[PDB]
Amino acid sequence: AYAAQRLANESPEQRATRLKRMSEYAAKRLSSETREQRAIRLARMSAYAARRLANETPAQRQARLLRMSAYAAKRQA
DNA sequence: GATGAATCTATGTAAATACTAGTATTTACATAGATTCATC
Protein backbone atom coordinates (compact mmCIF):
# COMPACT_ATOMS: atom_id res chain seq x y z
CA ALA A 1 0.00 0.00 0.00
CA TYR A 2 3.14 2.10 -0.39
CA ALA A 3 2.13 2.89 -3.93
CA ALA A 4 0.49 6.10 -3.01
CA GLN A 5 3.84 7.80 -2.62
CA ARG A 6 5.05 7.01 -6.14
CA LEU A 7 2.03 8.54 -7.74
CA ALA A 8 3.38 11.76 -6.43
CA ASN A 9 6.80 11.68 -8.12
CA GLU A 10 6.52 13.77 -11.25
CA SER A 11 9.42 15.18 -13.21
CA PRO A 12 11.35 17.18 -15.80
CA GLU A 13 11.93 15.07 -18.89
CA GLN A 14 13.95 12.83 -16.77
CA ARG A 15 10.61 11.23 -17.61
CA ALA A 16 12.07 10.72 -21.00
CA THR A 17 14.85 8.69 -19.45
CA ARG A 18 12.42 6.63 -17.48
CA LEU A 19 10.34 5.64 -20.50
CA LYS A 20 13.41 4.84 -22.56
CA ARG A 21 14.31 2.43 -19.71
CA MET A 22 10.80 1.01 -19.37
CA SER A 23 10.88 0.28 -23.05
CA GLU A 24 14.29 -1.25 -22.74
CA TYR A 25 13.18 -3.76 -20.05
CA ALA A 26 10.07 -4.68 -22.13
CA ALA A 27 12.02 -5.41 -25.24
CA LYS A 28 14.46 -7.60 -23.34
CA ARG A 29 11.63 -9.34 -21.44
CA LEU A 30 10.00 -10.32 -24.76
CA SER A 31 13.29 -11.67 -26.14
CA SER A 32 13.52 -14.02 -23.17
CA GLU A 33 9.99 -15.11 -23.73
CA THR A 34 9.29 -18.76 -24.52
CA ARG A 35 6.68 -19.66 -27.06
CA GLU A 36 4.41 -21.01 -24.22
CA GLN A 37 4.81 -17.76 -22.32
CA ARG A 38 4.04 -15.60 -25.34
CA ALA A 39 0.88 -17.65 -26.06
CA ILE A 40 -0.14 -17.20 -22.54
CA ARG A 41 0.45 -13.37 -22.67
CA LEU A 42 -1.51 -12.99 -25.89
CA ALA A 43 -4.28 -15.23 -24.45
CA ARG A 44 -4.88 -12.83 -21.57
CA MET A 45 -4.66 -9.86 -23.95
CA SER A 46 -7.27 -11.33 -26.27
CA ALA A 47 -9.32 -12.03 -23.10
CA TYR A 48 -9.06 -8.41 -21.92
CA ALA A 49 -10.07 -7.06 -25.29
CA ALA A 50 -13.10 -9.36 -25.51
CA ARG A 51 -14.16 -8.01 -22.20
CA ARG A 52 -13.69 -4.37 -23.15
CA LEU A 53 -15.61 -5.02 -26.38
CA ALA A 54 -18.41 -6.63 -24.41
CA ASN A 55 -18.58 -3.46 -22.22
CA GLU A 56 -18.29 -0.81 -24.80
CA THR A 57 -20.83 2.06 -24.83
CA PRO A 58 -22.45 2.84 -28.20
CA ALA A 59 -20.34 5.95 -28.38
CA GLN A 60 -17.15 3.84 -28.04
CA ARG A 61 -18.51 1.28 -30.51
CA GLN A 62 -19.28 3.77 -33.12
CA ALA A 63 -15.93 5.70 -32.81
CA ARG A 64 -14.23 2.25 -33.20
CA LEU A 65 -16.34 1.29 -36.24
CA LEU A 66 -15.81 4.74 -37.82
CA ARG A 67 -12.13 4.55 -37.22
CA MET A 68 -11.72 1.09 -38.69
CA SER A 69 -14.04 1.81 -41.57
CA ALA A 70 -11.75 4.82 -42.42
CA TYR A 71 -8.61 2.75 -41.94
CA ALA A 72 -9.73 -0.21 -44.06
CA ALA A 73 -11.11 2.12 -46.73
CA LYS A 74 -7.86 4.14 -46.74
CA ARG A 75 -5.81 0.98 -47.25
CA GLN A 76 -6.40 0.67 -50.98
CA ALA A 77 -2.96 2.23 -51.53
C1' DG B 1 -13.34 -9.99 -54.03
C1' DA B 2 -15.69 -6.09 -51.92
C1' DT B 3 -17.03 -4.50 -47.65
C1' DG B 4 -17.47 -4.01 -42.87
C1' DA B 5 -17.34 -6.15 -38.27
C1' DA B 6 -15.24 -9.35 -34.81
C1' DT B 7 -11.04 -10.70 -32.92
C1' DC B 8 -6.27 -10.41 -32.03
C1' DT B 9 -1.74 -8.01 -31.22
C1' DA B 10 2.79 -5.03 -31.43
C1' DT B 11 3.79 -1.26 -28.74
C1' DG B 12 3.91 1.89 -24.80
C1' DT B 13 3.65 3.09 -20.02
C1' DA B 14 0.72 3.57 -15.73
C1' DA B 15 0.68 1.16 -11.56
C1' DA B 16 2.18 -1.60 -8.44
C1' DT B 17 5.88 -4.04 -6.07
C1' DA B 18 10.33 -6.02 -4.93
C1' DC B 19 14.52 -4.64 -2.94
C1' DT B 20 17.97 -1.53 -0.53
C1' DA B 21 12.91 6.80 1.33
C1' DG B 22 14.61 5.88 -2.60
C1' DT B 23 15.70 3.13 -6.63
C1' DA B 24 14.83 -0.95 -9.64
C1' DT B 25 12.01 -4.18 -11.57
C1' DT B 26 7.59 -6.46 -12.90
C1' DT B 27 2.71 -6.72 -13.64
C1' DA B 28 -1.60 -5.07 -15.58
C1' DC B 29 -3.94 -2.53 -18.66
C1' DA B 30 -4.73 0.52 -22.72
C1' DT B 31 -3.85 2.59 -27.42
C1' DA B 32 -4.06 2.10 -32.08
C1' DG B 33 -3.52 -0.64 -35.37
C1' DA B 34 -3.36 -5.34 -38.01
C1' DT B 35 -5.57 -9.66 -38.96
C1' DT B 36 -9.20 -12.88 -39.18
C1' DC B 37 -13.99 -13.76 -40.10
C1' DA B 38 -18.84 -13.04 -41.98
C1' DT B 39 -21.73 -11.55 -45.68
C1' DC B 40 -23.03 -10.60 -49.77
* CA separation for the pair A20, A26 (Å, rounded): 10
Q: How far is the CA of A52 from the C1' of B20 (A)?
A: 39
Using what technique was this structure determined? X-ray
List the one residue out of A3, A27, A5, A37 whose CA is nearest residue A19: A27
3-state helix, strand, coil in chain A (%, to 5): 80, 0, 20
Q: Rounded to an integer, what distance in angstroms lies between the CA atom of residue A48 and that of residue A55?
A: 11
Closest by Cα among A41, A17, A18, A19 to A29: A41
**Distance measured from the CA of protein residue A26 to the C1' of nucleotide B32, in angstroms:** 19
**Domain locations in chain A?**
1-77
**Residue A28 CA, nucleotide B7 C1', distance (Å):** 27
What resolution in angstroms, rounded to 1 decimal?
Answer: 2.4
DSSP A40: H
Residues touching nucleic chain B (CB < 7 Å): A 1-3, 5-7, 9, 15, 19, 21-23, 25-26, 29-30, 42, 45-46, 48-50, 52-53, 65, 68-69, 71-73
